[PDB]
Each structure stands twice: as structure tokens, then as C-alpha cells.
Amino acid sequence: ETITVSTPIKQIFPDAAFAETIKANLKKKSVTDAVTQNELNSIDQIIANNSDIKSVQGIQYLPNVTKLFLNGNKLTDIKPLTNLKNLGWLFLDENKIKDLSSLKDLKKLKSLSLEHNGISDINGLVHLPQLESLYLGNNKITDITVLSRLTKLDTLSLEDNQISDIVPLAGLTKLQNLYLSKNHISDLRALAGLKNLDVLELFSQEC
Numbered sequence: 372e373t374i375t376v377s378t379p380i381k382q383i384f385p386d387a388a389f390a391e392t393i394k395a396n397l398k399k400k401s402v403t404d405a406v407t408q409n410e411l412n413s414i415d416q417i418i419a420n421n422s423d424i425k426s427v428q429g430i431q432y433l434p435n436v437t438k439l440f441l442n443g444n445k446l447t448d449i450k451p452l453t454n455l456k457n458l459g460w461l462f463l464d465e466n467k468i469k470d471l472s473s474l475k476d477l478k479k480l481k482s483l484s485l486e487h488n489g490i491s492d493i494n495g496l497v498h499l500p501q502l503e504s505l506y507l508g509n510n511k512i513t514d515i516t517v518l519s520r521l522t523k524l525d526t527l528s529l530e531d532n533q534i535s536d537i538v539p540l541a542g543l544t545k546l547q548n549l550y551l552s553k554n555h556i557s558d559l560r561a562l563a564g565l566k567n568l569d570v571l572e573l574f575s576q577e578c
Contacts, residue, residue, distance in 0.1 A: 372431060372432065373408045373411075373432060373434075374406075374407070374408050374411070374432060375408070376407075377405040377406070377407055378405055378406065379402075379403055379404065379405050379406075380393050380394050380397075380399065380401075380402045380403070380404060380405075380406055381402045381403055383406070383411075383429040383432055384402075384428065384429035384430075385426060385428050385429065386424055386425055386426040386427070386428065386429075387402070388422050388423045388424045388425070388444075389419070389422075389424045389426065389427055389428075389429065389430075390402040390429075391422070392417065392419040392422055392424065393406075393414075393417075393429075396414060396417060396418075397410055397413075397414070408432070411432050411433050412433075412434060412435055413435075414433045414435065414436055415435045415436055415437045415438065415457075416436065416437065416438040416439075417430075417433075417436060417438070417439050417440065417441075418438075418440045419440060419441055419444070420440050420441065420442040420443055420444075420462075421442065421443035421444065421465075422441075422444060423444065423445065424441065424444040424445060424446065425444070425445040425446065425447075426446070426448070426451075427441070427446065427449070427451045427452070428451050429451070430451045430452065430455070431451050431453075431454065431455075433455070434455070434456075434457070435457055436455055436457065436458060437457050437458060437459045437460065437479075438459065438460045439452075439455075439458060439460070439461050439462065440460075440462045441461075441462060441463050441466065442462050442463065442464040442465055442466075442484070443464065443465040443466075444465070444466055445466065445467075446463065446466035446467070446468055447466070447467050447468060447469075448468075448470065449463070449468055449470070449473045449474075450470075450473050451473075452473050452474070452477070453473045453475075453476060454476065455477065456476065456477070456478070456479065457479055458477045458479060458480050459479055459480060459481050459482070460480075460481065460482045461474075461477070461480060461482070461483050461484070462482075462484040463483075463484060463485050463488065464484050464485065464486040464487055464488070464506070465486070465487045465488075466487075466488055467488060467489060468485065468488050468490070469488065469489065469490055469491075469492070470495075471485075471493070471495030471496065472495055474495060474496075474498060474499060475495065475498040476498070477499065478499075478501065479501075480499055480501070480502060481501065481502065481503045481504065482502075482503060482504040482505075483499065483502060483504070483505050483506070484505075484506040485506065485507055485510070486506050486507060486508045486509050486510065486528070487508075487509045487510070488510060489510065489511060490507065490510040490511065490512060491510070491511040491512055491513065493507065493512060493515070493517055493518075494517050496517050496518070496520075496521065497517050497520050499521065500520055500521060500522065500523065501523055502521050502523060502524060503523050503524060503525055503526065504524070504525065504526035504527075505521065505524060505526070505527050505528070506527075506528045507527075507528060507529050507532070508528045508529065508530040508531050508532070508550065509530070509531040509532075510531075510532050511532065511533060512529065512532040512533065512534060513532070513533045513534060513535070514536075515529065515534060515536070515537070515539050515540070516539050517539070518539045518540060518543070519539040519540075519541075519542060519543075521543070522542065522543060522544075522545065523545060524543050524545060524546060525545045525546060525547045525548065525567075526546075526547065526548040527540075527543070527546060527548070527549055527550070528548075528549075528550040529550065529551055529554065530550040530551060530552045530553050530554070530572065531552070531553040531554070532553075532554055533554065533555060534551070534554040534555060534556060535554070535555040535556060535557070536558075537551065537556055537558070537559075537561045537562075538558075538560075538561045539561075540561050540562075540565075541561040541562075541563075541564060542564070543565075544564070544565065544566065544567065545567060546565055546567060546568055547567050547568060547569045547570065548568075548569065548570040549568060549570065549571050549572070550570075550572045551571075551572060551573050552572045552573060552574045552575050552576075553575045553576075553577075554576055554577075555576060555577055555578055556573065556576050556578075557576065557578050559573070
């Protein structure tokens with residue numbers, strides 16, 4: 372939502388680490404300093420990799436964020452991102468996020484990264500048919516049937532998982548960069564129809 376009056380950063384963002392992130396972003400002197408909705412509206416980019424963040428509560432007040440870098444934090448719940456309609460790049464590597472229902476309305480999201488999150492179920496991705504780059508390396512994925520729905524993908528990383536069947540990728544004609552090393556792939560018939568691959572990694576398969 373929005374704040375109707377000058378409010379301390381710490382009151383909007385409960386996580387002490389995230390509050391620090393916002394304070395540094397707005398160039399304020401302290402997380403105790405007050406901020407206005409006009410200032411929060413000016414934020415379109417948050418760079419907070421490895422910042423020891425457990426919660427992004429409060430981020431709901433930044434309607435215009437388009438780039439969010441949150442790699443290597445302590446996140447588990449990304450519900451606060453649900454109405455961030457302008458989100459275009461979302462990096463969430465090295466966290467423990469499994470509930471991807473909060474991404475269903477991010478219709479402008481073009482690049483998503485969820486590596487090292489212990490994920491196995493990616494069915495929630497069906498709601499992002501416009502996705503162009505997707506990084507899911509180092510997880511516990513086996514079934515990628517949903518990916519047949521993401522026809523706009525040109526870059527896809529599924530390295531270090533437990534995939535055997537890649538037939539779902541057969542119709543992703545826009546693929547240029549495909550990372551499939553460290554999986555259980557033997558049948559490559561699925562690549563016969565791909566004409567735009569520039570980078571393809573298939574080494575270290577364990578069958």
C-alpha cells in the first residue's frame with residue numbers, strides 16, 4: 372500500500388538488515404529517519420545481495436521497483452512481492468524460497484533467478500509465460516513439464532538438479548543458452564528441433 376505521512380524507515384521495514392538497505396538506497400543517515408511515499412515511489416532498484424535479510428516486509432510500499440537483487444540472504448517468504456507489478460529482474464539465489472505463488476501476477480518479470488533454494492516444484496512458473504531468462508541451477512528439480520509453457524525463454528539454466536526428461540524443452544525454439552550439466556540426461560532427441568542454441572552444456576550426466 373502507501374504511507375500517508377512521514378514515517379520512520381524502521382517502522383515500515385521490520386527487518387533490521389532490510390531497513391539498512393532502504394536507508395542506504397535513499398541516502399538517509401539512519402534507519403530511524405522518516406521517509407515519505409514520494410521517496411519510496413522513487414525506488415526502482417534495490418541491490419541487496421548477501422545482506423543478511425530474513426524478511427522484505429515493507430517492500431510492498433515501493434510500487435516502482437523493477438530490479439531486485441536479493442542473492443544470498445535468509446529469505447523464505449516472498450509474499451511481500453505479490454503486487455510489485457513492474458518487477459522485471461528478480462534475483463533470489465541462495466535463500467530458501469519454495470512458495471512461488473507470489474510470482475503469479477508479476478507479468479512484466481523477464482529474468483528470474485532461484486538457484487540454491489532447495490526447490491523441487493516449479494509448477495508455479497506456469498504464470499510467467501513471458502519469462503526470457505530463468506536460472507534454476509543447484510536445486511532438486513526432476514520434473515520440468517511446466518517449462519513447455521515458457522516459450523519466450525532464450526536463456527535457461529537447470530544445471531545440478533535431477534532431471535532425466537528434457538522433452539518439455541523441445542518446443543522452446545528461442546533457446547540460445549541452455550545449461551544442463553550435472554543431471555541425469557541420456558536422451559537428447561529433444562534438441563533436434565532447436566535452431567538457435569549458441570551455448571549448450573551437457574557434461575557430467577549421471578545415468
